[PDB]
């Protein structure tokens, strides 16, 4: 008739994977984390010192205060319905690095550079993305084994 409290229904949020138990690999303490960086939260089930609660595992947000061995992240939590900006402290192994900026930061380089090679030829930029267009009009030869190749059913008898 309940949940309440603080770690309920975490038989699979903080379960370990198949055979990734054991000593946490030591790169997790070695990562550098800055202020304003973006970060994910997967609560690591083998470290009880300040897990995120279950309402923040899965959620990304911006660091804005780093300490000795934990980080104070800003995670958007939807309440009803006024989305709040939370201010969560978590440790390091309950955090990963985002990748969602990482593609864009290589798009900022190239749009700086696709205009840089076009700095000399002049024209023209064509910087912004497009979603998938229709392909074109082709024509395709068989050329290579003319048609039929002809699938026709016979699908029951069984």
């Amino acid at each position: 008739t309940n949940s309440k409290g603080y770690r309920r229904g975490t038989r699979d949020m903080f379960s370990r994977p198949f055979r990734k138990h054991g000593v946490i690999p030591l790169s997790t303490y070695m990562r550098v984390f800055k202020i304003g960086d973006i970060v994910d939260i997967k609560g690591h089930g083998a470290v009880q010192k300040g897990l995120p609660y279950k309402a923040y595992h899965g959620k990304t947000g911006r660091i804005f205060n780093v300490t000795q061995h934990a980080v104070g992240v800003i995670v958007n939590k939807r309440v009803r319905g006024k989305i709040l900006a939370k201010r969560v402290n978590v440790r390091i192994e309950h955090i990963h690095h985002s990748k969602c900026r990482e593609d864009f930061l290589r798009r900022v380089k190239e749009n700086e550079r696709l205009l840089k090679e076009a700095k000399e030829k002049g024209q023209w930029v064509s910087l912004k993305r497009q979603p998938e267009q229709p392909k074109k009009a082709h024509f395709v030869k068989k050329l290579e084994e003319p048609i039929a190749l002809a699938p026709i059913p016979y699908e029951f008898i069984a």
Partner: protein
């Protein structure tokens, strides 16, 4: 037995399988505070072997440890230490060696002369003001029991008498009897000068010639009598402070794919020709009787 054992079993790491690290000091040493983001640790490795001890200063990184400088006891026959390379006193000069093999990289040679008259007192260095604060390091012994007066702490005693600021106590220096302390500094001056190795000979000069056919042989091959061992170890200290030449080598080279050598690994073709004849040999063993 033990077949679905293997589907579920996963392995302790690599260097807990080899038995080399411990990963319970490794987390706790190399932890820097995550607000002093990337300024490294600079710990001090001391690893010892049957032949030759090893001291490297290093700091870990994501991609394996970086190493700033390393110094082995095998370099010591340059400086007059011919045999007896795993003494405590032979461990002293190696930790003395990197503590001058590294300050040339920083140019910290005008400052922090260190305990130039070594006698066995805990002369942690002083930060000489208006500029360069002293180099910092922390001891990493790893997998040796830190018992009272082990060989690994003379290497530490080499470094703090070299000039590197390491926090340490004396409770694992030799001869500081914990019943009860007994800040007896002078037993270092008998150990860091190696004299109790010599006084082991002076208490064995008289009993057995076969004792010299036993342990501390080959001092007899070099005529190393049991009297002048300090005079070796005094001379090293003023000669290690001459030139740590960092072991430059210009062979360049005889290394490449000599000679084959180690039994390359049989691709699938010649695997199949091995199986093709073996199946042909077994029917040939069967066609023999018929």
């Amino acid at each position: 037995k033990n077949k679905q054992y293997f589907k579920r079993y996963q392995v302790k790491f690599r260097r807990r399988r080899e038995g080399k690290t411990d990963y319970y000091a490794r987390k706790r040493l190399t932890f820097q505070d995550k607000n002093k983001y990337n300024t490294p640790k600079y710990r001090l490795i001391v690893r010892l072997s049957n032949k030759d001890i090893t001291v490297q200063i290093a700091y870990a990184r994501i991609e394996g440890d970086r190493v700033v400088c390393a110094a082995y006891s095998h370099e010591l026959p340059k400086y007059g230490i011919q045999v007896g390379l795993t003494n405590y006193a032979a461990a002293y000069c190696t930790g003395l060696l990197v503590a001058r093999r590294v300050l040339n990289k920083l140019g910290l040679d005008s400052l922090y002369a260190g305990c130039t008259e070594v006698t066995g007192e805990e002369f942690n260095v002083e930060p000489v003001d208006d500029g360069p604060g002293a180099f910092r390091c922390f001891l990493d012994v790893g997998l040796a029991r830190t018992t009272t007066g082990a060989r690994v702490f003379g290497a530490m005693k080499g470094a703090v008498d070299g000039g590197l600021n390491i926090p340490h106590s004396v409770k694992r220096f030799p001869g500081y009897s914990a019943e009860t302390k007994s800040f007896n500094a002078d037993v270092h001056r008998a150990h860091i000068f190696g004299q109790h190795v010599a006084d082991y000979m002076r208490s064995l000069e008289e009993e057995d010639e076969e004792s010299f056919k036993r342990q501390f042989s080959r001092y007899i091959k070099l005529g190393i009598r049991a009297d002048d061992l300090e005079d070796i170890y005094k001379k090293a200290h003023q000669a290690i402070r001459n030139d740590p030449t960092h072991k430059v080598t210009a062979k360049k080279s005889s290394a490449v794919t000599k000679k084959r050598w180690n039994a390359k690994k049989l691709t699938n073709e010649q695997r199949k020709t091995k199986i093709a004849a073996h199946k042909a040999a077994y029917v040939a063993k069967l066609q023999s009787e018929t």
